[PDB]
Amino acid sequence: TXPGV
Amino acid sequence: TXPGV
DNA sequence: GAAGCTTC
DNA sequence: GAAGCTTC
């Protein structure tokens, strides 16, 4: 994902 | 990333 | 270098 | 299952 989430 | 980008 | 989820 | 970048 993101980086992060 | 995303999904997608 | 661990650290990943959901496109399509 | 190919398909990934940038945190920290």
A2 touches strand D (CB under 7 A): yes
Residue B5 (CA) to nucleotide C7 (C1'), in angstroms, measures 11
Q: Tell which phi-psi region holds residue B3, choosing left (phi > 0), alpha (psi between -120 and 50) or beta.
A: beta
- The residue whose CA lies nearest the C1' of nucleotide D4 is B1
Contact partners, residue A1, CB within 8 Å, separation at least 6: B1
Residue owning tokens 């994902």: A1
Distance CA B5, CA A1 (A): 9
Report resolution (Å) to 1 decimal.
3.0
Distance CA A4, CA B5 (A): 14
